[PDB]
Amino acid sequence: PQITLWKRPLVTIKIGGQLKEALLDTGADDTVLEEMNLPGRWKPKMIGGIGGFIKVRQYDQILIEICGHKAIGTVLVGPTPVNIIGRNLLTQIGCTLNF
Amino acid sequence: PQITLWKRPLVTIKIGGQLKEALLDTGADDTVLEEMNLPGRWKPKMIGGIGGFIKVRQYDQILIEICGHKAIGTVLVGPTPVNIIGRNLLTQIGCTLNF
Numbered sequence: 001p002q003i004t005l006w007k008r009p010l011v012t013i014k015i016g017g018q019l020k021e022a023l024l025d026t027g028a029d030d031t032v033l034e035e036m037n038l039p040g041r042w043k044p045k046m047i048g049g050i051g052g053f054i055k056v057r058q059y060d061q062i063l064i065e066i067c068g069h070k071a072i073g074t075v076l077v078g079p080t081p082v083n084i085i086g087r088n089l090l091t092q093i094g095c096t097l098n099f
Numbered sequence: 100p101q102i103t104l105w106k107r108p109l110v111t112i113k114i115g116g117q118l119k120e121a122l123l124d125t126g127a128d129d130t131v132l133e134e135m136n137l138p139g140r141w142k143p144k145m146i147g148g149i150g151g152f153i154k155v156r157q158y159d160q161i162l163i164e165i166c167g168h169k170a171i172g173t174v175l176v177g178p179t180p181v182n183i184i185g186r187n188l189l190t191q192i193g194c195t196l197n198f
């Protein structure tokens with residue numbers, strides 16, 4: 001679909017079998033989700049954005065469906081204020097900016 | 100134009116007589132630019148990122164040219180590591196997400 005930006009581009013996602021609301025974020029290199037339980041091994045990582053750094057758990061090769069489009073890639077889980085879908089997954093669903 | 104998301108969507112902007120590189124960020128409600136000396140009145144503001152908040156100066160009705168597309172609105176200025184073009188200005192240049 002074509003999504004205007006008068007409101008936050010929030011969409012429903014499905015990960016680990018659970019439905020969530022997440023932000024399509026072209027300003028994010030990575031995908032970071034709020035604290036949750038995901039199966040599989042993880043590695044402790046840290047990312048620094050505006051405001052400082054946070055500790056996250058990196059899950060690789062995680063299935064995630066974004067607005068009906070499937071993706072498999074790296075998902076970070078930690079104390080992020082909002083579920084963020086980053087460019088690593090936005091590219092997989094064929095997302096582009098257009099004006 | 101159409102901008103893929105394989106790399107950071109960075110584009111050239113013109114503000115206050117200066118040319119700069121800025122990030123088209125659908126995950127940013129507002130626009131925040133690296134520290135610069137804009138004239139006129141301003142109001143303090145704090146904006147939240149992934150790691151916390153930073154203090155910025157809010158300037159209203161500031162003209163910015165984004166890829167040749169003009170826009171006028173609120174521009175925040177503060178210790179941001181990256182120039183960020185937010186939804187308040189992306190809407191003005193007719194920017195959409197498409198997949």
Ligand SMILES: Cc1cccc(C)c1OCC(=O)N[C@@H](Cc1ccccc1)[C@@H](O)C[C@H](Cc1ccccc1)NC(=O)[C@H](C(C)C)N1CCCNC1=O
Nearest residue numbers: 027028029030047048049050126127128129131146148149
């Ligand atoms: C939310 C908001 C409100 C008002 C004004 C502004 C500018 C606002 O946006 C501020 C903001 O940080 N939004 C982020 C997502 C957001 C929305 C709401 C709350 C919190 C965050 C995201 O889109 C932009 C921001 C840019 C950035 C900053 C420093 C270093 C690198 C990149 N990108 C990142 O932080 C990403 C994270 C998300 C994986 N990130 C950090 C690891 C390095 N690379 C990278 O890409």
